[PDB]
Ligand binder design. Sequence first.
Ligand SMILES: CC(=O)Nc1nc2c(s1)C(=O)NCCC2
Length: 246
Amino acid sequence: EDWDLVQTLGEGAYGEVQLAVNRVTEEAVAVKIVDNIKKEICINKMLNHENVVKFYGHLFLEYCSGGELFDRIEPDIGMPEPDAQRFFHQLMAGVVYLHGIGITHRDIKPENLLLDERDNLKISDFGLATVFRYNNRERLLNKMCGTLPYVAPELLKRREFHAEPVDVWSCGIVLTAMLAGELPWDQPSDSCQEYSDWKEKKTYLNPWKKIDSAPLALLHKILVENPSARITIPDIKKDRWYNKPL
Ligand SMILES: CC(=O)Nc1nc2c(s1)C(=O)NCCC2
């Protein structure tokens, strides 16, 4: 049970992450080194799912030899549609799970989506995650959080908003990234030309031009500005592209 620090896997944020191999058993794990932290550990303790980075102790986290999904996205091209769909199915299984136990990640992006040895996707980094349901009671969010290109529009213009649609929106931006190798906009504000174009349905422009019509139909349903109108996860599960054999 005396781990060794073999190499640095990741850097940035308070601390840096390293690969830790057990001396005896030789189990490989990852260590996040930070000197906010109390909640991440708290939240991690609740998490048990095959599409969420496992929490071992304290941080000691499941090791993903696959790397970041981000590094499976060729710039300006994306990836083969079948891979995108499989990654999206798993991204959805993971989110359904978090929402089921009343947790929102709040920072979904390809940098926070890891892959294991069988290319299984793992939601990682709950440092920004928070509780949005407790005792069957929903709490609206009010703190602005995340990463501008993945963030939903309501987060920028409403004092308070629901947690789930914010996560749905960001999953859509990820899907866009997977099928086009580019992010549609710097942020979903009106001042942003690229977001205004999308609202006006100018889909002949990039990145939408690069996306087949079936997936794009789903992106039209996810990237809806009104969070009340935005598609929910159970309805994403019934979507034709989502259910298209590939
Ligand atoms: C490139 C890479 O492997 N980055 C990683 N960051 C982490 C990795 S891998 C990990 O294995 N587990 C939990 C999150 C920290």
